């Protein structure tokens, strides 16, 4: 029994499925994008969330082909429904460290964007600060080519002081994520509020967009809107959903 051969079997059998989590403007309104999350629809185990297998797939050496297949499925799922997406609609992916160490990522992005009318979507790739600190000439070239396509880069797991500012500036990152762990402590923990304020301050300094994760309550939403946070995701906005559910909801929003 080979876990790595099982992952390859699964990939060939199209068991890795995109689930779509909506992003909302901080001030409310129609969804402005989705973040794509890879689930494994395992015939015996049921639906498995990515934190339960992505780390192993990275170790196995399979994460890039899996992410490529995911990007391909999203093009097939949404590229024929551009009329349901308001121009500029964001489509976000979590990109693994190994995918960042290659230039094939540029071609993967170029292909996904070609499935929609030019400029119609904004592709957003989410990386960690480690990918900026542990960078090389490949990184420099990758970020420059992706930016020239109109791809935007979002960063998680970052510092907020002048040392981190230098990396964010060098690579001309576009967005910061607010981790759910800070959002969950809005109104309950003073320090967390200070951390959140520090992230907002860095964003203002570098003119970055902010996506806040794990937004579950109206209190959290209003706190974050009060600080100009651009985009929200979490239970309040909606859980990750299968394509059928997304299309149903988009149809409704196009009608209003």
Numbering used by the authors: 5 to 260
From the paper:
DGC domains containing the signature GGDEF motif synthesise c-di-GMP from two GTP molecules while EAL1516 and HD-GYP171819 domain-containing PDEs are responsible for the hydrolysis of c-di-GMP to 5′-phosphoguanylyl-(3′-5′)-guanosine (pGpG). Hydrolysis of c-di-GMP by EAL domains has been shown to require the presence of divalent ions, either Mg2+ or Mn2+, with the most efficient reactions occurring at alkaline pH2933. Here we report as yet structurally uncharacterised EAL domains from the core genome of Pseudomonas aeruginosa, PA1727 (MucR) and PA3825.
PA3825 is a two-domain cytoplasmic protein consisting of a structurally uncharacterised N-terminal CSS domain, with a predicted fold similar to the extracellular receptors of bacterial dimeric histidine kinases, and a PDE domain. The β5-α5 loop of PA3825EAL, residues 160–170, undergo significant changes between Mg2+-c-di-GMP bound and metal-free-apo states. The β5-α5 loop moves towards the active site and contributes to the formation of metal binding sites via two highly conserved Asp residues (Asp160–161). The restructuring of the β5-α5 loop and the functional role in metal coordination is thus conserved across different dimer interfaces. The substrate- and product-bound forms of PA3825EAL are characterised by changes around the α5 helix, consistent with an activation step from the apo/ground state induced by dimerisation.
